[PDB]
Amino acid sequence: PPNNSNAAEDDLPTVELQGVVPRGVNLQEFLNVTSVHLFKERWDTNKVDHHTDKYENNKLIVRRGQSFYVQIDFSRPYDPRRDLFRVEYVIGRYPQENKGTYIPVPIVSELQSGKWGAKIVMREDRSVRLSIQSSPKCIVGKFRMYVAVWTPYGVLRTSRNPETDTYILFNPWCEDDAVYLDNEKEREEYVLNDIGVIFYGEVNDIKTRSWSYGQFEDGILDTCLYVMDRAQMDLSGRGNPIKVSRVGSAMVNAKDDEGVLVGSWDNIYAYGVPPSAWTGSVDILLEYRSSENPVRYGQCWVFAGVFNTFLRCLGIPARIVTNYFSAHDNDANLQMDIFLEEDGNVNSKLTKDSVWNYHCWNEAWMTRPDLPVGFGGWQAVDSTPQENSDGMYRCGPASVQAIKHGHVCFQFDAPFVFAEVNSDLIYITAKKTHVVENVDATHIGKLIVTKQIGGDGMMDITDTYKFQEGQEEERLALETALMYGSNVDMDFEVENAVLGKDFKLSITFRNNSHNRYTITAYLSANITFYTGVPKAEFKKETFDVTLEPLSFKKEAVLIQAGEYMGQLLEQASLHFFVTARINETRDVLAKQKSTVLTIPEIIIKVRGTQVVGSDMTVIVEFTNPLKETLRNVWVHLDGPGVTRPMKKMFREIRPNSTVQWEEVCRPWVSGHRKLIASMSSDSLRHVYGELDVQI
Amino acid sequence: XXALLPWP
Ligand SMILES: [Ca+2]
Ligand SMILES: [Ca+2]
Ligand SMILES: [Ca+2]
Numbered sequence: 220p221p222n223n224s225n226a227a228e229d230d231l232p233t234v235e236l237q238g239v240v241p242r243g244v245n246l247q248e249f250l251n252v253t254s255v256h257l258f259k260e261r262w263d264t265n266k267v268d269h270h271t272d273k274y275e276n277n278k279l280i281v282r283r284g285q286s287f288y289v290q291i292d293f294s295r296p297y298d299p300r301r302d303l304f305r306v307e308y309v310i311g312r313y314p315q316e317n318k319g320t321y322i323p324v325p326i327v328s329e330l331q332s333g334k335w336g337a338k339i340v341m342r343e344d345r346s347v348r349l350s351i352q353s354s355p356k357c358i359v360g361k362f363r364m365y366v367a368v369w370t371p372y373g374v375l376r377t378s379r380n381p382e383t384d385t386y387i388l389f390n391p392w393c394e395d396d397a398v399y400l401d402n403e404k405e406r407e408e409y410v411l412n413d414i415g416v417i418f419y420g421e422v423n424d425i426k427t428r429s430w431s432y433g434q435f436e437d438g439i440l441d442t443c444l445y446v447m448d449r450a451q452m453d454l455s456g457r458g459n460p461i462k463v464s465r466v467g468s469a470m471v472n473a474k475d476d477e478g479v480l481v482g483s484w485d486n487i488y489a490y491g492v493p494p495s496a497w498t499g500s501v502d503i504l505l506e507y508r509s510s511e512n513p514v515r516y517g518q519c520w521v522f523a524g525v526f527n528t529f530l531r532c533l534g535i536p537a538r539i540v541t542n543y544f545s546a547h548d549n550d551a552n553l554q555m556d557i558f559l560e561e562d563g564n565v566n567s568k569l570t571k572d573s574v575w576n577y578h579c580w581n582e583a584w585m586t587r588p589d590l591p592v593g594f595g596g597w598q599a600v601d602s603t604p605q606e607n608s609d610g611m612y613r614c615g616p617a618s619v620q621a622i623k624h625g626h627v628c629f630q631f632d633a634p635f636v637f638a639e640v641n642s643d644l645i646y647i648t649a650k651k652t653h654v655v656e657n658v659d660a661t662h663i664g665k666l667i668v669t670k671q672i673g674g675d676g677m678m679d680i681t682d683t684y685k686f687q688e689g690q691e692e693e694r695l696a697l698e699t700a701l702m703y704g705s706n707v708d709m710d711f712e713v714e715n716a717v718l719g720k721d722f723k724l725s726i727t728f729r730n731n732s733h734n735r736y737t738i739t740a741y742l743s744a745n746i747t748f749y750t751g752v753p754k755a756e757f758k759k760e761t762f763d764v765t766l767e768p769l770s771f772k773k774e775a776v777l778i779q780a781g782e783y784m785g786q787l788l789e790q791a792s793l794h795f796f797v798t799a800r801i802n803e804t805r806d807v808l809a810k811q812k813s814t815v816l817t818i819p820e821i822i823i824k825v826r827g828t829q830v831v832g833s834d835m836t837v838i839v840e841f842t843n844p845l846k847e848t849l850r851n852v853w854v855h856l857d858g859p860g861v862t863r864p865m866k867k868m869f870r871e872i873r874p875n876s877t878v879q880w881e882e883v884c885r886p887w888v889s890g891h892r893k894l895i896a897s898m899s900s901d902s903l904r905h906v907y908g909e910l911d912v913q914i
Numbered sequence: 915x916x917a918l919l920p921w922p
Contacts, residue, residue, distance in 0.1 A: 419915060484916065495915050518916045544919070557921050565921055573918045644921065662922055 220313060222320055223451045225360045225444045227312035230379070237373035244372055250302050252366045252377050253345070254292035257385070264288065270392060270411065275437035279383070282390035282534060283458070284355025286330065289337075291366060292346045297339075303369045306337055306351065307376075308362040308385065311454045318455045319358050323367075324351060333395060353387060355395035358458040359533055360444055361386050386440065389460060389534030397586045398460050399750070400536050408672045409536035409584065415527070416670045417520045418541040418677055419577050425668075425677065430524045430539075431499025434532035439501060442508040443532045446470050449477065460535050460585040461616055464600045465631060469613035471526045471602030473513035476611070479503065479525055482604055483516040491515025500528035522602045523579040536584035538669050540599075540680060545578035546663045547605055548638035553627075553701055555644045555663070559656060569649055574663065578603070578639065580614070582669075587618055590629050592751035592813045593794035594618035597683065599636045608632050619683050620753045624743065624796045625699030626811060637700045640664035640684045641693075661688045691761045692741045695798045699809045705801045706732040707766065709808040713795065717844060718816040719784065719906045724776040726797055728766050736766040740799035742776060746783060747813060749790035757783045766801075784905060792816075819844040821854075821896045821908025831886040831914050837862065839896045842877040845903065852900040854880055860888030861912060872900075886914040 598616030
């Protein structure tokens with residue numbers, strides 16, 4: 220049956236004999252555990268280094284993909300020649316190794332990147348200190364810990380011990396984690412800050428409401444796990460922040476699933492707390508856990524406050540955003556259909572769509588391995604019930620970046636979120652036949668804000684959701700969104716793109732028709748982290764082109780090195796959006812593609828014994844990667860312990876040709892040092908090489 | 915707090 224409850228547990232045998240073991244077997248020869256220490260105090264290095272010292276829980280809490288120390292005391296000293304044991308972490312009533320819910324942790328010589336293992340780092344008398352490393356993809360929840368000693372007769376295992384139950388959470392600090400956030404100030408605000416501010420009111424009279432998220436309070440972490448159990452969420456999926464956030468968007472509202480909060484807007488709030496009386500999430504969540512029933516009542520900011528608690532508590536970085544004049548699309552066509560009677564007054568009967576003074580939802584930070592690269596980062600998630608998504612009231616995660624460019628085809632619920640922030644108003648006269656009377660392109664989504672880092676101030680984030688009103692890109696992206704819901708083909712290629720050089724983006728239009736068309740288009744060029752998280756837009760252009768009949772037309776867009784080189788990082792890729800409208804037909808052609816820059820190599824080698832005080836020869840090798848002559852090439856060599864910084868100049872390097880530079884150095888600082896080489900010429904610039912050296 | 919507004 221489904222392993223969908225963290226609270227449930229199986230009973231692991233302590234004496235797990237195999238086969239027909241003879242009477243009078245003597246298990247005395249084998250190790251038994253006398254004691255397990257988790258060093259779990261809130262002042263100690265595990266909780267401090269794992270950023271979990273703030274929780275009011277006395278159990279060990281760690282974050283996945285990062286190592287922690289434990290100590291196992293045995294009946295006699297562990298002897299690798301004769302003894303074999305492993306640690307086990309187990310979750311749910313029906314754990315299975317191939318599901319990630321029974322996790323054997325082997326005792327290894329060296330921890331391996333990304334892999335569960337435990338290394339012995341100290342031995343004193345009968346004790347061993349282990350450094351345990353978890354997988355960065357580990358299921359998030361509360362695990363039972365066991366020590367299993369292997370014997371010819373079967374396994375001898377420690378008894379159930381609630382005092383060693385171990386919570387493993389998402390890890391914004393681990394570069395291999397889906398929720399990795401590379402900025403400490405942002406991790407502090409969006410994970411560790413347990414108070415916040417939620418903006419409301421009107422666009423020109425902005426009000427601020429304080430909110431206590433309380434993710435670290437006694438009982439809250441347990442309640443978040445309870446929420447997932449209440450959802451019957453399969454344990455195997457709880458290491459996936461896409462799934463966890465989508466579950467959270469359903470479960471924070473009461474509809475469908477007996478979730479946390481019952482929405483009401485009736486100005487009466489019979490037999491409950493009025494939505495405006497709450498000042499934080501803790502009372503609501505603790506009451507949910509204790510009564511095991513939905514809590515009355517909330518509205519958008521209360522749903523958002525509780526959902527924010529849930530996210531941060533589990534370790535998914537999160538924030539609350541407020542959208543002013545927020546559209547509610549009821550018939551999924553991404554526009555506000557306002558039916559107007561003949562009198563001119565609005566038909567309140569036919570008009571179903573609506574607009575709110577403001578609405579609040581959440582953003583959760585994660586990669587999106589299920590989407591093309593470029594669409595990770597902030598994902599809109601919304602637990603306020605408005606429209607069903609695949610049978611339930613839930614919403615997201617929708618990539619905010621996908622929403623911005625109208626690529627609303629990418630899951631989940633991007634079209635609805637797009638309409639919330641940027642649907643047009645379409646005033647329609649229903650006659651006894653439907654006549655369009657007016658279009659309002661600027662009413663919806665006047666301003667989108669979130670709490671600033673480091674203060675209670677407002678940060679304007681409207682530009683992350685939509686291009687500016689009145690800009691051509693705002694219309695092109697909307698028309699793209701409507702499209703995803705002429706006999707012209709559009710494609711583009713980035714031609715021979717080398718890191719450190721200008722390059723061309725080539726956009727091609729093929730007109731197979733006998734018509735002349737005119738095109739209005741935009742290009743957006745972006746830097747993206749290797750994991751597919753967007754970093755910044757470095758170039759944006761709009762353009763017009765005329766397309767003759769029966770013809771192919773290329774439009775070359777130059778991208779200069781200075782436009783992107785200031786914003787690169789290791790293994791970053793480039794993400795391009797081209798959206799073109801055929802003006803006469805209103806047809807929209809929209810493509811997105813990513814590319815990796817070709818990276819020119821500089822090779823550093825050393826010749827001679829590397830001992831502080833004696834001479835070593837560094838050989839820097841560089842090959843011209845271009846079909847063009849490099850001119851005035853400067854090569855630099857840097858090495859803080861190894862060499863005074865040095866330069867060699869090459870007047871000219873022919874195409875595909877190799878140069879070598881030998882530099883004699885004498886190190887003045889022993890140990891783990893490093894050599895860094897740089898090359899800049901007139902055309903190709905700021906290409907590097909590096910080599911760790913041991914002095 | 916949150917409320918539906920009339921169309922402009
Ligand atoms: Ca629900
Ligand atoms: Ca509509
Ligand atoms: Ca608009």
